Amino acid sequence: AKKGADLVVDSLEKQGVTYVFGIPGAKIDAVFDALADRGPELIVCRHEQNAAFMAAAVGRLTGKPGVCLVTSGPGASNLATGLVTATAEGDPVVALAGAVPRADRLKRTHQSMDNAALFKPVTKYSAEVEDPDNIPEALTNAFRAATSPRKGAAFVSLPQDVLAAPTEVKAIGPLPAPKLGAAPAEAIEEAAEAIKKAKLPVLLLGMRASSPEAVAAIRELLAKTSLPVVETFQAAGAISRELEDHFFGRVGLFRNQPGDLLLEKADVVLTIGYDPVEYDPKLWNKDGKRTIIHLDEVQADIDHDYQPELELIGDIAATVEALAEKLAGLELSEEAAALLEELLAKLAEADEPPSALVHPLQIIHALRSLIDDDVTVTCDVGSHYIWMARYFRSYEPRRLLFSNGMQTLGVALPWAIAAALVRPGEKVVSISGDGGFLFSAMELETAVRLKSPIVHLVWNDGTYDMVAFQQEMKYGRTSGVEFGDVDIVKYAESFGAKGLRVNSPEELAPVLKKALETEGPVVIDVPVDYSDNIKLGEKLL
Amino acid sequence: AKKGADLVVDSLEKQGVTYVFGIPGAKIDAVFDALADRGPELIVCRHEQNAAFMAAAVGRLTGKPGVCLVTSGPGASNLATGLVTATAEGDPVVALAGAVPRADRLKRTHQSMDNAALFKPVTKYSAEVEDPDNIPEALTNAFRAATSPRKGAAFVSLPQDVLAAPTEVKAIGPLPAPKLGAAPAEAIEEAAEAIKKAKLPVLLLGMRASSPEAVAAIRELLAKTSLPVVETFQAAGAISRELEDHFFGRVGLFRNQPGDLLLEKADVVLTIGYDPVEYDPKLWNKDGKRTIIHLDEVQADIDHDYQPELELIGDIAATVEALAEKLAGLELSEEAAALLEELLAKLAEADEPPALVHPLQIIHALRSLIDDDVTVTCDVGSHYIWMARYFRSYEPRRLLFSNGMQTLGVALPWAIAAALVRPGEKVVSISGDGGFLFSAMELETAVRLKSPIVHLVWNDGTYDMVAFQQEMKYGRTSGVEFGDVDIVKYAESFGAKGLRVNSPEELAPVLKKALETEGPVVIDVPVDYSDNIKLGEKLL
Amino acid sequence: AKKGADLVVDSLEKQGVTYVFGIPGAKIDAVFDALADRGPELIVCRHEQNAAFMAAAVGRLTGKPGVCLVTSGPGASNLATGLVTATAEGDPVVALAGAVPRADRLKRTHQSMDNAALFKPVTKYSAEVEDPDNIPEALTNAFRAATSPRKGAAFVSLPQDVLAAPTEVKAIGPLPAPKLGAAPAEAIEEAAEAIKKAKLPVLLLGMRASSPEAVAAIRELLAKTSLPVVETFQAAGAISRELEDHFFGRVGLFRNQPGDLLLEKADVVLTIGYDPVEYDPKLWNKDGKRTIIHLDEVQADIDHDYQPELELIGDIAATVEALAEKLAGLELSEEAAALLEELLAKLAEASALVHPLQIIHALRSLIDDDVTVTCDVGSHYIWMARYFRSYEPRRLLFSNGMQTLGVALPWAIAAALVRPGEKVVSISGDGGFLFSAMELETAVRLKSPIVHLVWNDGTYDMVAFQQEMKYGRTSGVEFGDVDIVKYAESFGAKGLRVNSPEELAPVLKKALETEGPVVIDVPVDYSDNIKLGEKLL
Numbered sequence A: 001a002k003k004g005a006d007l008v009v010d011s012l013e014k015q016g017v018t019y020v021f022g023i024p025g026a027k028i029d030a031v032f033d034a035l036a037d038r039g040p041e042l043i044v045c046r047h048e049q050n051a052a053f054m055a056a057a058v059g060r061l062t063g064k065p066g067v068c069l070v071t072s073g074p075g076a077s078n079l080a081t082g083l084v085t086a087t088a089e090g091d092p093v094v095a096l097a098g099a100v101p102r103a104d105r106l107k108r109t110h111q112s113m114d115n116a117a118l119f120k121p122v123t124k125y126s127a128e129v130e131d132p133d134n135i136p137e138a139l140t141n142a143f144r145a146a147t148s149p150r151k152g153a154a155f156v157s158l159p160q161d162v163l164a165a166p167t168e169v170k171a172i173g174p175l176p177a178p179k180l181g182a183a184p185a186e187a188i189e190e191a192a193e194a195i196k197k198a199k200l201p202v203l204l205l206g207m208r209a210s211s212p213e214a215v216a217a218i219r220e221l222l223a224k225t226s227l228p229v230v231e232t233f234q235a236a237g238a239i240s241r242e243l244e245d246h247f248f249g250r251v252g253l254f255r256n257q258p259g260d261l262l263l264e265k266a267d268v269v270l271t272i273g274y275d276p277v278e279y280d281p282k283l284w285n286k287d288g289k290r291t292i293i294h295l296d297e298v299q300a301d302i303d304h305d306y307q308p309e310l311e312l313i314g315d316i317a318a319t320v321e322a323l324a325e326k327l328a329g330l331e332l333s334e335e336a337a338a339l340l341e342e343l344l345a346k347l348a349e350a351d352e353p354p355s356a357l358v359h360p361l362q363i364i365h366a367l368r369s370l371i372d373d374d375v376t377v378t379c380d381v382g383s384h385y386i387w388m389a390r391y392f393r394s395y396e397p398r399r400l401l402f403s404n405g406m407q408t409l410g411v412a413l414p415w416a417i418a419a420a421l422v423r424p425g426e427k428v429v430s431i432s433g434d435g436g437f438l439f440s441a442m443e444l445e446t447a448v449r450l451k452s453p454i455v456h457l458v459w460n461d462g463t464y465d466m467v468a469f470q471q472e473m474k475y476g477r478t479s480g481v482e483f484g485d486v487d488i489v490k491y492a493e494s495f496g497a498k499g500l501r502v503n504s505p506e507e508l509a510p511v512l513k514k515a516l517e518t519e520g521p522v523v524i525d526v527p528v529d530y531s532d533n534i535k536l537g538e539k540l541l
Numbered sequence B: 001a002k003k004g005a006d007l008v009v010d011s012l013e014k015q016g017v018t019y020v021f022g023i024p025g026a027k028i029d030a031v032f033d034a035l036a037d038r039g040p041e042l043i044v045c046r047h048e049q050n051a052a053f054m055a056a057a058v059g060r061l062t063g064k065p066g067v068c069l070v071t072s073g074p075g076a077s078n079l080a081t082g083l084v085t086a087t088a089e090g091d092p093v094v095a096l097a098g099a100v101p102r103a104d105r106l107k108r109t110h111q112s113m114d115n116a117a118l119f120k121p122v123t124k125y126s127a128e129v130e131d132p133d134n135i136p137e138a139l140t141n142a143f144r145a146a147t148s149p150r151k152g153a154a155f156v157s158l159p160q161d162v163l164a165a166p167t168e169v170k171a172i173g174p175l176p177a178p179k180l181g182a183a184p185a186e187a188i189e190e191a192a193e194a195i196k197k198a199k200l201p202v203l204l205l206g207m208r209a210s211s212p213e214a215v216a217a218i219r220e221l222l223a224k225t226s227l228p229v230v231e232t233f234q235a236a237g238a239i240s241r242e243l244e245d246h247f248f249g250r251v252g253l254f255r256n257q258p259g260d261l262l263l264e265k266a267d268v269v270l271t272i273g274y275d276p277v278e279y280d281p282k283l284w285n286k287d288g289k290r291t292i293i294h295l296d297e298v299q300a301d302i303d304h305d306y307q308p309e310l311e312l313i314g315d316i317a318a319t320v321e322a323l324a325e326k327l328a329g330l331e332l333s334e335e336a337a338a339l340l341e342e343l344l345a346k347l348a349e350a351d352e353p354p355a356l357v358h359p360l361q362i363i364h365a366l367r368s369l370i371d372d373d374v375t376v377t378c379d380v381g382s383h384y385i386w387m388a389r390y391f392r393s394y395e396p397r398r399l400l401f402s403n404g405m406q407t408l409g410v411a412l413p414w415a416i417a418a419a420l421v422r423p424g425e426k427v428v429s430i431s432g433d434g435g436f437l438f439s440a441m442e443l444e445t446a447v448r449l450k451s452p453i454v455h456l457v458w459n460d461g462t463y464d465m466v467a468f469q470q471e472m473k474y475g476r477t478s479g480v481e482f483g484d485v486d487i488v489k490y491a492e493s494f495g496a497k498g499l500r501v502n503s504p505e506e507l508a509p510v511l512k513k514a515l516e517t518e519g520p521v522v523i524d525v526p527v528d529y530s531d532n533i534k535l536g537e538k539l540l
Numbered sequence C: 001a002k003k004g005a006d007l008v009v010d011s012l013e014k015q016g017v018t019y020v021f022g023i024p025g026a027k028i029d030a031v032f033d034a035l036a037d038r039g040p041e042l043i044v045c046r047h048e049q050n051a052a053f054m055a056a057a058v059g060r061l062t063g064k065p066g067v068c069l070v071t072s073g074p075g076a077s078n079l080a081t082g083l084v085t086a087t088a089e090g091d092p093v094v095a096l097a098g099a100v101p102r103a104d105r106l107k108r109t110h111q112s113m114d115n116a117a118l119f120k121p122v123t124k125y126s127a128e129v130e131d132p133d134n135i136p137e138a139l140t141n142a143f144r145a146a147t148s149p150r151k152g153a154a155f156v157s158l159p160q161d162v163l164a165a166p167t168e169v170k171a172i173g174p175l176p177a178p179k180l181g182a183a184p185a186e187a188i189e190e191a192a193e194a195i196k197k198a199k200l201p202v203l204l205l206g207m208r209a210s211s212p213e214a215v216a217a218i219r220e221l222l223a224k225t226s227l228p229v230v231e232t233f234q235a236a237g238a239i240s241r242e243l244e245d246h247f248f249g250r251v252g253l254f255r256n257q258p259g260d261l262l263l264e265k266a267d268v269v270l271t272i273g274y275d276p277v278e279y280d281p282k283l284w285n286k287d288g289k290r291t292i293i294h295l296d297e298v299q300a301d302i303d304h305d306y307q308p309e310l311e312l313i314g315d316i317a318a319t320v321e322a323l324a325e326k327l328a329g330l331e332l333s334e335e336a337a338a339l340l341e342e343l344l345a346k347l348a349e350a351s352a353l354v355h356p357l358q359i360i361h362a363l364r365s366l367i368d369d370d371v372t373v374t375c376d377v378g379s380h381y382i383w384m385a386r387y388f389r390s391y392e393p394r395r396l397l398f399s400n401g402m403q404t405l406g407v408a409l410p411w412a413i414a415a416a417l418v419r420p421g422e423k424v425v426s427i428s429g430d431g432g433f434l435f436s437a438m439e440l441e442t443a444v445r446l447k448s449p450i451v452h453l454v455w456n457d458g459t460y461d462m463v464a465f466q467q468e469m470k471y472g473r474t475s476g477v478e479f480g481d482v483d484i485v486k487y488a489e490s491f492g493a494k495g496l497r498v499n500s501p502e503e504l505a506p507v508l509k510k511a512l513e514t515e516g517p518v519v520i521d522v523p524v525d526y527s528d529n530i531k532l533g534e535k536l537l
Ligand SMILES: Cc1ncc(C[n+]2csc(CCOP(=O)(O)OP(=O)(O)O)c2C)c(N)n1
Pocket: A380, A381, A382, A383, A384, A385, A406, A407, A408, A409, A432, A433, A434, A435, A436, A437, A459, A461, A463, A464, A465, A466, A467
């Protein structure tokens, strides 16, 4: 006989799952025993939060779900943040959690909890299997749900006794969630005329635009047009070095960017793969003096300040390259040419440098200058994520990963561990702050164990700056943002990672190159100069 | 100056809502006051249940959401079944419910209840607005959610104080929910080859295949091919009288039909707009010796016994007429020609009738007396098995079933709505003795609207579907017998005309007079239910 | 061999469930087959809604859960309103519903639904059992949850295959949910002192005061004191004809009653079994600085205008009799005596159509204290709540927690089952009557000794006269006519009509003498209903 836990592993190996991020427990150790002989490799993590973070990173970089595996109760509830972040940022994840047996469901036993009810608000798919026979079906649809447009987390609760119960059904095959056609040809033609008749057409790329397939088709469009482009944070990597002329910056949390002015002067905006989570439409479209065209894999959500005049629902890559044929050779007006060149001048101006503290822009330029396009960069949340988002340039798809949907602390380091597994042989850079670093720093042990070729930069200010300089704006006074010091170099070494410090701005470029040449995980303490951070919230008008 | 309630009506005005089925209350009477001055016509209903039944009928027939409007607490909770039936059967509805004010939400006060949490398991979209400014956005997205593929119910809870609070925001224009392209051209080409290589290809049409646009593209294809089609109860209407040769019956609750045998012998099945709610794949694909091709607006759910080898997701109409081009002139094998002819004989044979009137002679009498411009609505029960498998409907959405939830009572409210969507047409409703009373209150609404309805009550004195299934499993019924209600008296309490068929010889006359009768009519039909156990027989 | 469904009936037998109001279906017919050979009697209903109303009535009248039994999907969802009403009005109910099998949970198949999630907002207990062995435990606790203080509805979803799966576990024996002690004796003494110092103390009885055990202890206290009392609608029946001197009306939906004044002039209010669902505290404790003492079986919920200075949590009957010993023989202030007498005087001051008061006085004069009277919701429920006096516990049942339409007639069928040999009177309006009128067939089937009065006005007056107050215009309240006599006779019940005010008393007496169900059409005069919401305070 073969039990339900066997049939979980079989399902996972039908999906081609190469790794599983887990922490074992009594209610789930059946599956961990099955994995001992066969199936995906098991990355033992040091907190379930980071196992979900790693699963989301796999989703972001491959487009197929990453997999975490945890036990009942506390193990399951430690996924909560990990899966909201996945779901909100379009990262496919399949979370597998144990549960008490079916007879103990309604009982007060150790670690009993309504797993499925908890994860309903934070997943595309939350379910508990109550028959071992249905495990193959539940998991296949969970994977398909996580991969289907508007990607996200699929949670499946597995009772201890169903995992141990015998079953004779086979695992379901690899059944790929399929792709769509392009938007209707009449709609694509309608959007084309609008763009041609426009005086300042602008492209707004969003979180779904930055997939390899979408980026290839978008670059194809930009090669054939004069079309200006602005990016949401997670759209990074769409334009290339070749097409950098089309790039007018990343529109962010405050409407104070050259990209925001460009969106205002537009009379026609083609949003591609645009999710409002990254940029509230009330920020850039308040007056409603623009035709919006919504190109996306799923219809739009209507805001007061987001009323698509047209929607091109279908495969972004298919619709855009159908639209490229219709827009090929479109040139811009001379008054648009003047406007765009002037904005590039402002864009290059803010990307210039200004104590033994290293200013954030010196970090960005030094690091960009030291890594090729074949290095993935992950980034935590904080003021450092504002600086990176608006000034660090990534020219190949999905080489600069941000948490801009839920903005959760700690993602950087686990994402980097996952990034190195997805992309072996490649260095990976992870950027965090002093506060968020401790949200996930436990996985430095997992990094050292995998010898992850990681270089983590901890920007040290001593405070939770993003929340602070916002508090200063609203109240003239921070509150609850200060914390004591931890020696980042000594911290790295307790884990057997290499720890370095940048005690001068003169010292930054040398420390980076030694760390990049260093084999195995490395953590660099960067005392950072946050004098200018309040300016990130300043207003243009 | 404008309050939140005004901005609800303005939103309804923007979606082109013609009617709103409502029952007022303290917490929602702001909106009922705004409807008094302008906006959709308000059909006062006699139970919130039937307002949601009608809302779903509007969605079934127009493809745009029907709207019900109810108050807090009891008004809201009486929508529950109406919204699960709408969601499970792809009927767009937007249910609007009042709630206690924001300051009273966490308090134990009259009619307080977590509206949004209650409807989460039973809707596409369950939300409570907590700012009057957000009303136009919440309702637009609720409407777009109901009409997004896999259509269903969108519930919006409306706190009293929000409806009364002022606001200056404008209503949001009609932002139509958009349609997809055809499935990728390489996938359509791949499906076409499989069908040409297939010894016996069969189409399985489902609940999404019976839309006007889908049906138009399906008929075009069948005009250009020799393709056999089997339908799920709610796929009714897809095949016209011209293409009736292609039709091999409706596959149902039991695997005992010629259409089931045809699905078995197929080596390639192209499912169009197929939702398994109507027919478990365990029931017709148990051996898994078929190429399944899933054509639909949304990807499939994987069963053990449903693993499509190809999926063509996209606008069904676009994908089908793309595929019609590739398959034009496809011919059957001569061994397929023989097989299908033999099955049509088995199909014609079962569709043959023997003081009670047999279910078949009802169907033949009724079909013979109503044109294709007459909508027919059916309740759930043994009558719904007879109607689903033996009443033929040849124009899209002229035979409405509850085959997703199998909810009792739907028939009569569905007819009241159907007559409002299609004025100047007769509407026939079919129910049994038990299900009629679930919804019989709305006969007052029908008389009020003078709905041109002709409601047939298949009278047996029991809940036969539950019984003959109980007899199959346990050799004994339990809790299926109930006392008799004079259907003719019942109709006349409400001011409707009541007729009874005392003899089979009297059926055709009684039908014709009822159809010529202006205003609602209820017909008591004493039926012969000796043969109903045979609907569940194992014949294969 | 024993299956899970057998073990569902065995559990019910252990709870002493006499009747089960149900509608069978494919997913639950296992239990309907088990119920065919033994155990609880099955009342076939004509809508699950009503099955839940009848179950709630059994809970209201016995204090032990009533039981309804339905199938998956539509059968389950037709309980929603029934169970939130029960839960809001403290009526113990155990709802049992079929569900698709455990392998088809996550499948898009007929009548599949998240039963447990749906009923979480509406019950004190919503669960699906996924192991037949766990059936006796899940039910026992469900029954105990429904009977537990702050009683309400417990929902149990039963997968079809679990019902069919073998099991050898036994059922669990009647597990009586237990009783509490009286509140701490220090707290009772503390409250007692506050009352003796008070110049005008007032009791506010609520929905948990009207249980038999509470009422007996309350009457004992009132016999030994000069305490004035005011009731919530569902507190009806607390005060006997002997102690009517203590009763100062039922505080209602508007703050315009003599009872609302005594509440204002009170310097101390001892609330007993008080649930704010019946009367929002902002209506009476709004303006003043009266000491609130919360006596109840569960702690209070803090309102801005309800901040008790003391709480006596525990068995209400034990607490009030302990407090009766501390307050025996306490007599009123002369300033309180004058006040009370004046407001008894304000109290007793209260066309072919019949005026609502004439109905109330005719009916009250015709029926004993051994006649249950149920009432629907509508303007008639205002007239009955304020002016129909009920002198024995739980003989006047109102839906004053959810205010759901249709409860009256099903409540009466259930009431006749729990109290056989007694006539039952049910009162409804033209609108609410059609919400539940189907069950007239069930009534005829059981020959329930019911007399149903339809106050026939032509509209939904409560909303109408409230709409008039707020907007000066009704909207959506008017509906066509139904012949209530012809309707009754469709079902084989007798139908009667009062064509004259002079004909009312005769037809009631003929209806009361008539055996089996009766529906009386009453054309009612609703001119004065606007005044129910008038200011007089
Ligand atoms: C899990 C989580 N906790 C808290 C926050 C709120 N938050 C956002 S940025 C921030 C400050 C982070 O400080 P640090 O990581 O040191 O970066 P800095 O802003 O100092 O550069 C906080 C507390 C969040 N978004 N997610």
